[PDB]
């Protein structure tokens, strides 16, 4: 996934609060999340891919092998089971917890990196540009 | 309540989607509501006060006597029991349904009419100016 490697900064967000509402994020956490303009850093070392999100109030990091299910603690503190595969040139992530699931797709669009999150019909689109 | 009589147009809204989320309004209805820039029309005839909200997709109207509980069907289709009193120069409305309650205060601030809605700690502020 060489096309994803680098540091990206958030430029626009659409329906993110609605997505968080659907996932079940609390009011306070939703407000902090909506204020943050995180930087996403993606790197690859051998077969391990690392996706790091940095913001003044919270940094997250996940290192994984494409196709192998792993444990992830989300920014909003959910303990989920995640699997990320490379399909059609996009990184497709599925998070599962308490009988629920949500999909997060990270793809390239022109010179931008687009992240699309879907939870029960509600779709959020976040656009990132290179830092 | 002569200070309230007239036609008012929405100028600003703050935390309205969060308030609707707390009240339990569905995604589609929340999106339509957030797009509407309603006009509020208040009139008094004898001891009956009428508050009418007009928008391209939905008009609502309630006529009541201050201090007497009445039935109201909200824009989002809730069947509630409402009571409106005049306190400190403000119209204070309490809606009750299914063991829940929310407060809606309509007050004058300068030349503006401010509507504040509170549901379990979440507060929304909508400002109106004369049309
Ligand atoms: C990525 C989170 C940005 C905000 C961080 C601060 C607080 C987080 C609080 C709640 C976040 C809830 C869900 C976010 C999880 C995945 C979305 C990643 C979207 C992106 O990649 O943009
Ligand atoms: C007043 C509603 C404006 C939007 C109308 C269109 C659709 C309504 C759908 C859902 C509305 C849900 C709750 C609104 C009820 C009271 C808030 C009045 C606020 C104001 O006086 O602004």
Rounded Cα gap, residues B86 and B39, in angstroms: 22
Rounded Cα gap, residues A55 and A73, in angstroms: 16
User: Which are the contacts of A122, defined by CB distance < 8 A and separation ≥ 6?
Assistant: A15, A18, A19, A21, A22, B27
Cβ(A72)–Cβ(A95) below 8 Å: yes
| Nearest by CB: A17 against B17, B22, B122 | B17
Exposure string (b/e) for A30-42, b if CB count within 10 Å is 16 or more? bebbeeeebbbbb
Coil, helix or strand at residue B41: strand
Tokens in use for A20? 């968080």
Ligand nearest to the CA of A125: 1
Q: Give the residue extent of every domain in chain B.
A: 1-131
Tokens in use for B99? 């063991």
Tokens in use for B6? 């007239």
Q: Please name the residue that has the structure tokens 């609605």.
A: A18
Residue having the nearest C-alpha atom to atom 17 of ligand 2? B117
Best mutation site among A18, A24, A124 for testing chain B: the one with the most B CBs within 10 Å?
A: A18
Rounded Cα gap, residues B74 and B54, in angstroms: 13
- CATH number, domain A1-131, options 2.40.33.10, 2.102.10.10, 2.40.128.20, 3.30.365.10: 2.40.128.20
- B88 contacts chain A (CB < 8 A): no
Contact list in B for residue A22 (CB cut-off 8 A) is: 27
Tokens in use for B121? 């700690």
Q: What letter does residue B75 receive in the DSSP assignment?
A: T
Whether B126 lines ligand 2, by a CB cut-off of 6 Å, is yes
CA of B10, closest CA in chain A: separation in Å? 23
Q: What letter does residue B111 receive in the DSSP assignment?
A: T
- B28 contacts chain A (CB < 8 A): no
Resolution of the model in angstroms: 1.6
Alpha helices in chain B (DSSP H): 16-23, 27-35
| Nearest by CB: A27 against B27, B30, B122 | B122
Rounded Cα gap, residues A87 and A113, in angstroms: 15
Cβ(A7)–Cβ(A131) below 8 Å: yes
Best mutation site among B27, B35, B123 for testing chain A: the one with the most A CBs within 10 Å?
A: B27
């Amino acid at each position: 996934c060489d096309a994803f490697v680098g540091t990206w900064k958030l430029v626009s967000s659409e329906n993110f609060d609605d997505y968080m509402k659907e996932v079940g994020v609390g009011f306070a956490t939703r407000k902090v999340a909506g204020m943050a303009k995180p930087n996403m850093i993606i790197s690859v070392n051998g077969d391990l891919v690392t996706i790091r999100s940095e913001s003044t109030f919270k940094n997250t990091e996940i290192s994984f092998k494409l196709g192998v299910e792993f444990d992830e603690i989300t920014a909003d503190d959910r303990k989920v089971k995640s699997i990320i595969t490379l399909d059609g040139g996009a990184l497709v992530q599925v998070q599962k917890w308490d009988g629920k699931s949500t999909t997060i797709k990270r793809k390239r669009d022109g010179d931008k990196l687009v992240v699309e999150c879907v939870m029960k019909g509600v779709t959020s689109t976040r656009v990132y540009e290179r830092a």
